[PDB]
Ligand binder design. Structure first.
Ligand code: MXR
Length: 367
């Protein structure tokens, strides 16, 4: 009858030590297990490296076509610390376009390429790690600290499924030109073809434009994945997966589960009037009320027509002056009579005080 419509879906068991599934637009956590346990991120570290780089290029600090000259510290076979790790095989003296180095970072997980771009972007690796951890602070991540540009095992570096899912959200949102690289399945440098090890890119059942893989014998098998269905986008991060086949199978389970049982809705957009309230002492009698940021809600799929919204005002009356985006109350979104999310009710257009004097006196005073 209606137990169907109010059904909570069982969450599938996940053969991973830590995971999280979130909606990209709404931020809603659909499923989680040990999402805040600090773990080693392995090459998921390179998501942040890519984020810092994308911010730099966004700010015009360098271009795709600028040629980086490879220094001694990015010499692949000149630094045995790189042994047994993925590399794009850079040698001192080469001039490699920025567009190729970031593809070594994102697609081949090339640790030498991270060193190349770090010195280029920030002058040194320490400076670049400083940018990384500063963006950790700027994004409000609470279980993430970086000590390398590549994600080779550093004793004091860690992250979490939630923080890595939030880093992936930040990538898609803040630096989309950089994020659009992760869907490329193959990249060739210096006559060596290497594959993007995110096998979900190959899965036709999903529209995975994918993020980053990572694996060390201490981290396990890590993968941050993102897919779309229509205009809904989900993000999954599993850490401590058992095998390469295991981490992708589990991630895919979360993404199809999330898509099948939940949907994302956009019930109100910025600048569209949600409500109207009288105003006192103003040049306008009424205030137009809405949101300063588009509302995205994640609800059970099919239940959109059952979504109801209402609002409360912080004060009994509204007195001018009122500014653009001044918060005067709360919008309540309810499903089945229960409030499922709130977002601030704000003034859509500033409303100054009365001032009804001769327009010319006004000018004259200025003049
Ligand atoms: C990041 O976690 C490390 C790097 N990244 C990956 C990955 O993209 O999944 C692994 S996979 C790579 C595939 N073949 C293995 C190998 O023996 N070599 C040397 C290429 C590893 C890899 C560990 C990064 C820190 O190195």
């Amino acid at each position: 009858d209606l137990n169907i419509k109010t059904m909570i879906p069982g969450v599938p068991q996940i053969d991973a030590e830590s995971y999280i599934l979130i909606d990209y637009n709404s931020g809603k956590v659909l499923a989680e297990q040990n999402a805040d346990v600090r773990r080693d991120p392995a090459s998921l570290t390179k998501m942040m490296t890519s984020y810092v780089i994308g911010q730099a290029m966004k700010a015009g600090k360098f271009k795709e076509t600028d040629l980086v000259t490879i220094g001694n510290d990015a010499w692949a076979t000149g630094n045995p610390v790189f042994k047994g790790s993925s590399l794009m095989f850079l040698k001192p003296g080469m001039q490699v376009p920025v567009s190729q180095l970031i593809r070594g970072i994102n697609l081949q997980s090339g640790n030498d390429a991270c060193v190349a771009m770090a010195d280029f972007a920030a002058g040194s690796q320490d400076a670049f790690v400083g940018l990384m951890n500063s963006y950790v602070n700027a994004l409000g991540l609470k279980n993430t600290h970086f000590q390398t540009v590549h994600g080779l095992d550093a004793d004091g570096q860690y992250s979490s499924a939630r923080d890595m899912a939030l880093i992936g959200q930040a990538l898609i949102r803040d630096v989309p030109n950089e994020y659009s690289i992760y869907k490329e399945k193959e990249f060739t440098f210096n006559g060596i073809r290497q594959l993007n090890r995110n096998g979900l890119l190959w899965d036709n059942s999903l529209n995975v434009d994918g993020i980053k893989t990572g694996h060390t014998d201490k981290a396990g098998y890590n993968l941050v994945a993102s897919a779309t269905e229509g205009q809904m986008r989900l993000i999954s991060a599993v850490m401590g997966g058992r095998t390469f086949k295991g981490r992708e199978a589990e991630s895919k389970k979360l993404l199809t589960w999330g898509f099948r049982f939940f949907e994302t809705v956009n019930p109100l957009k910025v600048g569209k009037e949600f409500a109207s309230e009288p105003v006192w002492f103003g040049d306008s009698d009424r205030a137009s009320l809405g949101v300063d940021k588009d509302v995205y809600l994640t609800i059970p799929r099919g239940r959109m027509k059952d979504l109801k919204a209402s609002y409360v005002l912080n004060s009994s009356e509204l007195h001018a002056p009122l500014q653009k985006n001044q918060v005067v109350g709360t919008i309540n979104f309810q499903l089945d009579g229960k409030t499922i999310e709130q977002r601030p009710l704000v003034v859509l257009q500033e409303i100054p005080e009365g001032n009804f004097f001769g327009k010319i006196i006004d000018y004259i005073k200025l003049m």
